[PDB]
Amino acid sequence: SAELKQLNQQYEKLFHKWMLQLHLGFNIVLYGLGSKRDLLERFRTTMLQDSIHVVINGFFPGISVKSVLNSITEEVLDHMGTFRSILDQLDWIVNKFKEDSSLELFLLIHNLDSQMLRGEKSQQIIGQLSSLHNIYLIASIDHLNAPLMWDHAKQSLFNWLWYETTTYSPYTEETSYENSLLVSLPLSSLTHVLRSLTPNARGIFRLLIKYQLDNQDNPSYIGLSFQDFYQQCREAFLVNSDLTLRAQLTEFRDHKLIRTKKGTDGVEYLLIPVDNGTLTDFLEKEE
Amino acid sequence: VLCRESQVSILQSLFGERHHFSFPSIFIYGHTASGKTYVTQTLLKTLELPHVFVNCVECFTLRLLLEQILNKLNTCETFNDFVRLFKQVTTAENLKDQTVYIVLDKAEYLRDMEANLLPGFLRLQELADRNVTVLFLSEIVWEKFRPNTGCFEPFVLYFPDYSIGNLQKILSHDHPPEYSADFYAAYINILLGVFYTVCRDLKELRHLAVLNFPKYCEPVVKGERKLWRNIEPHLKKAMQTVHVELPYYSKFILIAAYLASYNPARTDKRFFNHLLGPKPFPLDRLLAILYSIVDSRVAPTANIFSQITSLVTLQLLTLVGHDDQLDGPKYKCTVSLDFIRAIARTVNFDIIKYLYD
Amino acid sequence: KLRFETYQLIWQQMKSENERLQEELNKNLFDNLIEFLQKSHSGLREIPTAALVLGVNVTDHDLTFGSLTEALQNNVTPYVVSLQAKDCPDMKHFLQKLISQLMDCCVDIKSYMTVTQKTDPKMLSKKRTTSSQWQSPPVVVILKDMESFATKVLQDFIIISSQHLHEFPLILIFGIATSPIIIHRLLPHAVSSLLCIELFQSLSCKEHLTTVLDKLLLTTQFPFKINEKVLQVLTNIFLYHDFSVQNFIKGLQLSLLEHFYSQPLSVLCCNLPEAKRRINFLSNNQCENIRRLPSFRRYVEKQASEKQVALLTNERYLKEETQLLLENLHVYHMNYFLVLRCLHKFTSSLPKYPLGRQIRELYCTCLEKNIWDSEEYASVLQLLRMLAKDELMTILEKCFKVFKSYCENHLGSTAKRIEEFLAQFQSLDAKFEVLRENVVNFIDCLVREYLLPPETQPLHEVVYFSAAHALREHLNAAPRIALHTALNNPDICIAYKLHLECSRLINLVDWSEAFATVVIIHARFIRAVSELELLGFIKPTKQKTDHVARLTW
Amino acid sequence: LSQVQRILRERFCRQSPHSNLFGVQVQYKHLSELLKRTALHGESNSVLIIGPRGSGKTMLINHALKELMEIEEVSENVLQVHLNGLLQINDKIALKEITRQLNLENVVGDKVFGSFAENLSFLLEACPVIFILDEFDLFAHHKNQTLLYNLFDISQSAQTPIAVIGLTCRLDILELLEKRVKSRFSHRQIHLMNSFGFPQYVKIFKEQLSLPAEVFAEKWNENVQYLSEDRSVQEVLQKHFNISKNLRSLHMLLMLALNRVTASHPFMTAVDLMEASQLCSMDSKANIVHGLSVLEICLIIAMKHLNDIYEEEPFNFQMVYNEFQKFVQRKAHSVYNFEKPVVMKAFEHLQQLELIKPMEYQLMKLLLDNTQIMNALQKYPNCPTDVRQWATSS
Amino acid sequence: EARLRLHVSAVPESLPCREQEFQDIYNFVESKLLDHTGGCMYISGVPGTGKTATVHEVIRCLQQAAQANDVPPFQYIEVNGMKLTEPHQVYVQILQKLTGQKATANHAAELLAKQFCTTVLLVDELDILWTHKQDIMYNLFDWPTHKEARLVVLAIANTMDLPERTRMCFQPYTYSQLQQILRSRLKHLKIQLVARKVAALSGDARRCLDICRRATEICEFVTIAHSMEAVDEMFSSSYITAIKNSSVLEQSFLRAILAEFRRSGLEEATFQQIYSQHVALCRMEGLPYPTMSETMAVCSHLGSCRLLLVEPSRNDLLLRVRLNVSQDDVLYALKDE
Ligand SMILES: Nc1ncnc2c1ncn2[C@@H]1O[C@H](COP(=O)(O)OP(=O)(O)OP(=O)(O)O)[C@@H](O)[C@H]1O
Ligand SMILES: Nc1ncnc2c1ncn2[C@@H]1O[C@H](COP(=O)(O)OP(=O)(O)OP(=O)(O)O)[C@@H](O)[C@H]1O
Ligand SMILES: Nc1ncnc2c1ncn2[C@@H]1O[C@H](COP(=O)(O)OP(=O)(O)OP(=O)(O)O)[C@@H](O)[C@H]1O
Ligand SMILES: [Mg+2]
Ligand SMILES: [Mg+2]
């Protein structure tokens, strides 16, 4: 708990220096192990401070390069929402800036990697802006292929001052957005059961999922009978016989991937006893 | 005009008397240098029949093609509907009773313009009933022009290629400037004796005929027959005919890419169809082959990955999936192998040894 | 700060002379562009063209296309237009800008909603504005990249414009890197002829490199000098990575400034009087500071008494002795460069170039380690002792026509040693003469006048700039060194150890469970791995169910 | 004199409004009948004249329309509108074209009517009109078919005298009409033109070459009747018959042989027609092959070998280049050896001639038939014995 | 003027022989009209079933009833979809028929919304008002359901599925129904062996009146023989006729097609393959070699009249060729002699 603060302090001494670099037309860069939040937000509380500091978190999926240029142009710039064609947008904001001089705008991007910023148009924008001297850029990067997407023209448009900036802090608010699969039978055990079956068996299972999910908001859907599901499987060329579909549904039931419920009519109705969120995720993986 | 005399008799008699009617459409085919338009323009200029001459590749649109034809008769024109209107409205004591000629050159490009335009022109005579003859000439056989619903089939006239004898008689004796025409004849007879089997174009042969003429007769003014020996190696020099500075690691990336192009798949284990083309590269495979072949083992820097991106940007490398350049690159090497050998020679590395062949 | 006044001074002096020398290296090539263009204008349906080869540098030359717009608007000859290839996907934008640009080439010098332009009005401007000039203007249609021209588009314009021609004797300049074969590739043979090209040459980066170093950084004008390590790292970023004198320049500012934030001790970095003013301004803190560094401490080590404290305590005998250190210092550096050029015409003529070829090289290797201590130098010795004869008397007589040209023009000194050499070689023109001149080049020059960086006067710091590493962090952009070595060398440390260890593909049943055989405990490996996605040391991969697999090697 | 030429040229080239009507006797009755019914009485009808192209239609309708307007009551009270699918490509163009042919241009443009039909009805109400639609096929292709639907709709329910007469070559025409328009079309009133018998063809041959009553014409017609029976002219006419069965193709044949007739060649002969027939029988793609350079030929022979080896699979320049290199390899010295860029120039010229088609890194297939190739090689003027031996290697 | 007066009676006619359908529609409008409410009714059928005629009748009757004050007054509006170039002109029509007169489609639709937030609106063949966003249909059907809107809508089209993408359908006419209409006005002659002969059809009414009108044209220049001739001049398929009249080489080319098909068994083949077959047959018939320039002409003759479906001529030997006529039909046309 003790060490990190000192390092987040040492980088602060470069800060004023970066300010001068920011005057000279370059733009600083932090390649860390950890998050610079406490350091980039201390750069907001210590250095930037002042006014005209635009903040768009790239690990935030919410903000978008169009809504980046709005978020810059809407509130802080205050001029307008940026016009449809972003090249025209920057032509208006610039004919305001080229006309209105000596206005320095310091922007800090956490995780340029994005999206939305993946677009070569997005970094033709950030390329022009950070190329435009008034504003200035401090980006924090993670992706190993981050230097990949910056070409000659852009690493020229971005004159990047690259800094040790080896950071140990999480990756808490950066980590709050990313979801993983460890959070009923979970998805990966389901996949593990289904990967040793035939292609047509997986097709049968996906068809039954589809029926369960489409009707999930209807309390009167208790599932499909075997004759109905057998006709549906025949029409999709998943099964040609009673014996093979019955054997397949029995193998499923031994794994606990189907459950049957007697209707009023004495007929067995087929449901899957897995959370519909997990089944949804399964169909989004299988394609 | 020479050696076309037979085609002139067919095309002249077809014109008949100027107050008569002629074919609604005539279609001439042949090669570039066949002499088609030289014969057409002469006959129209000499007699002299009123006509217009238009290049279909110059006018791609209707507005331009149709406005040219209308203007040149002596006028805002969108669709072929108004051409017959304003062509029919074009009549005077000059055009009143007479056959009018419209020569569409490179009609092969009409096929790509407007569906109804080529049919409208083939029948233009009875559409305006103005006694018109549309003359199509193109290097494409008529069999490829036919549309689905059909058309009025024109007269297909064949302008044959010039023979080696037809070329000399046209090419030689008509400009013997400073000497006897027999001397210039023996010159051309030698010129064709070399270049004929390769270049049959009369246009280009006239160039070389002018180009190499001074050197042919140079032994004459210098006091030294049978000059075929003199210029033949010089002529054959023209027959079969008529330094990129790169960085080190860049050159190594490139030659590594080429070595990835030629040798493919599971040969990387041992090492570290040619007419078909160059293979695909996963960027990882290229970096692997690179570090494998480099034998200097410098750590990666942004500038190096920028080097490979710059390489693909210079079109020295090309990736099938432009969109997927950072997710997995499938890059493809373009250049080679002579350039690769040069890179190897300057660096001192050998391209041939790693080539599996 | 004073060093920034000196920055802008030096800086814009540098890009000034850079852009001017750009304009001269032009001027032979541009006087040969208007002399070629005026040779073809001196002497149907064929577009003549001009093919210029600019090797692999983009933005530095946009200046000179602005200056072809200008210069070739200046002769009263053409009105020039430039079509970019990327501007130019379709067949419309070239004829639109064709004409937009020659109705416009008529405008800018006088000091709509641009959708309105099409293929007509060029044919009108050298008709309507002037159909009868009578001497037709070229419009050199500067096709700044013809390589990126769309090939369909390319032949459609060379054929449309070619077909239309000699009403418009267009010539068109080619911004290009490579040799003629590649034009002959993207421009077909029909075009190779329609273009009627005469191949032309334009100077690349690497020449401007060696030139500019010989001239600029190694000028005696500006005191600033560089240590072996940022020279090596820089010329490594230039030679081994990026060829732009752009990135070497911006990197040279960043070196300039970077040092110039080191410590005030460089305020004495200026001309001897400009520096001595600062001597007067010096205060007791700085007196502490000169009392500190080595080559001063070394200069303090071989020395004396109360003398030594009037360095250490009573500042006056120092600041006197600063005018002793520094006067000398800026004497030494002159004594070098005078002599470095000297070396070059000697050994730049020589073969094997074992010690070096270009002037920047000798500067480099000379300063790196002792020339004498290196054996490749002695090899060059054996060479000069071999050649002898008239090759040497011609090249050496050219070392004085040309180096006495330096001390006649390029350099003022006047050092009195130079003169003695000079007389010696005059006398020769009229072996152990070559070996006493070389030994003069050895003991009198290489031993004495060429000497090292660290064997030099006191205070070789701050004029010569150490601390390469941080710039390489701030320019070379080496994130994966710090990353690799960091993640290797601790739950994410051990996580990357596993991500190294397991096999190739690791099944999340027995990866979650192998990481449970090997290793709250899980969440940090899913964040290690989700970063390793975000970092990119792995990917969230579908090659197998529930897997994480690296693209990075 | 040349008086012969002036006549046959308006007959052969331009389409003579007056000539002999062959085998249309039935069809003319039905057309002329209907035409009287709409013009003289107040009846409204619609009909399609449907045949192959080059036979029938336009002359039938032209002859019918002429005789119709020779009735004084007709010429004064009847207007006719001639439309064509090539000239009017849009039903809006057609509307303004009807407005023009009806001399109704005085609407004039001040009232743009709320509906397409209202504008059309307003024109007729300002009294029969005979609507001729040529290239009916194309009028069927206009967006929603407003002109056809509303013409038939007006032809049936409006009681305004109108005659909608289409001309098409499509046996598929009826399937191109919407269910609604097909109904309103006066159901399947259909005239078919088609063909004749060979003796009728020869009688036509002699009738079109002969001259009317206008001693010079009498002598001319005697010589034509002599031509009518000859083993040569007949065996030529049959060859054309087995293809044509069409009077327009015949007209072309008669025209080309008509150039052979001059003041020094008073009347046609068997040879005049045989020569004229030879010009039509030429195989166009064989003629183009005759003029290629020996390099281009060798490439085609390489492509031939590639379709016979790889079994009709496409190919690119590389494999052609290889197989072509195998041809010069035979001799150590370089005779046919040229630089790759030049060979590709010729290759690209074959494509420029559309003798090879795409689908180097592009795959292409050869557009020549092997019998065309082997025939062309035997007819090629300078063909070297080396390329011939190579041709038969396969 | 005896059997010629029978000409005069065919082209239009009156009054309807749809007795039961008429009553249903009358009561629909009368119901909605009596109540001072709105509604919509969709009417399906074949193009010849008397839909618009019946509606026009119902309207004239309702106007008569409106004169005696049997039913509320009054106004009626009709517009046809196929009478417009651009569907949105509909809003102009409706408004122009009402007050407010001329206006743009945008301003008109806004006005009609205001008026509708009694009148009978006939939209004949609204199949033509289909648009990507279908706003106009949604509006015409939504308007009558508004409280303040008193509007009755009668929508005619030919398909039953249209409203799926307050309903009625007109079935095609039967043997007796068609027989009825013809004799229904023959009253000049109260010749009737024919009216039943022509009466076997599918299913349009216009076919009957136009057919028999042609039969009278045959008679003058009526017996059952006259009507058989009339039908054989109309419904007779022209394809088999053309194959019989086709030239020699044209038939051999069809035989070539049938040969290639019998080899492959597919519905497509390339001009190159067909060409090989055509060569074989011309060799066996003693004919001259089929020069490829000729054979391309032939293949176009047969593709111009739609006996064949052929790719564009540019593709040369790669033309893919399909038969527009069933193989059994061709064999019957070639083998009948
Ligand atoms: N008999 C001849 N005498 C002299 N020159 C000729 C002759 N025939 C062709 N030429 C050359 O060819 C040119 C005429 O062009 P040509 O008639 O070949 O055009 P074209 O065949 O219509 O062109 P393309 O076929 O490419 O459309 C002349 O200007 C001349 O250079
Ligand atoms: N039965 C016939 N009677 C008179 N002339 C005929 C006959 N059959 C063919 N012809 C001749 O063939 C030509 C056919 O011209 P027409 O335009 O009338 O029909 P078409 O060519 O089929 O029309 P389309 O332009 O639709 O092809 C005319 O020149 C005509 O002289
Ligand atoms: N029962 C009938 N009595 C008399 N004529 C009839 C009868 N049924 C249909 N018709 C004919 O049909 C026409 C009436 O049109 P109909 O009601 O079929 O139009 P529609 O069905 O709306 O048209 P479509 O269905 O093609 O849109 C009349 O002109 C008349 O010739
Ligand atoms: Mg016609
Ligand atoms: Mg209706």
Residue numbers in the entry:
A (entry chain B): 284 to 466, 471 to 574
B (entry chain E): 8 to 81, 95 to 244, 251 to 268, 299 to 328, 349 to 433
C (entry chain C): 41 to 83, 97 to 164, 188 to 506, 548 to 606, 628 to 657, 676 to 709
D (entry chain D): 17 to 142, 152 to 239, 244 to 388, 398 to 432
E (entry chain A): 490 to 606, 614 to 661, 674 to 698, 705 to 735, 746 to 861
What does the article say, verbatim?
To examine the functional significance of HsORC1 movement, we employed both negative stain and cryo-electron microscopy (cryoEM) to obtain the structure of a more complete HsORC particle. The purified HsORC1-5 described here is a fairly unstable complex, consistent with the dynamic assembly and disassembly of HsORC in vivo. Cryo-EM data were collected on a Gatan K2 summit direct electron detector in a Titan Krios electron microscope operating at 300 kV, resulting in a ~20 Å resolution 3D density map. We docked the crystal structure of the HsORC motor module into the EM map, which had an excellent fit. HsORC has the appearance of a right-handed corkscrew composed of the AAA+ and WHD of all the subunits, and a ‘decorative’ handle made of the large helical domain of ORC3. The RecA and RecA-like folds of the subunits (ORC 1, 4, 5, 3 and 2) form one layer of the corkscrew, with a little gap between the RecA-like domains of ORC3 and ORC2. The WHDs form a second layer with each domain sitting atop the RecA domain of the neighboring subunit. The structure of HsORC has an open ring architecture with a ~35 Å central channel, in contrast to the closed and more restricted central channel of ~15 Å observed in DmORC. This larger opening can now easily accommodate a DNA double helix. However, in addition to the drastic reorientation of HsORC1 in comparison with DmORC, the position of the WHD of HsORC2 is also clearly very different between the two complexes.
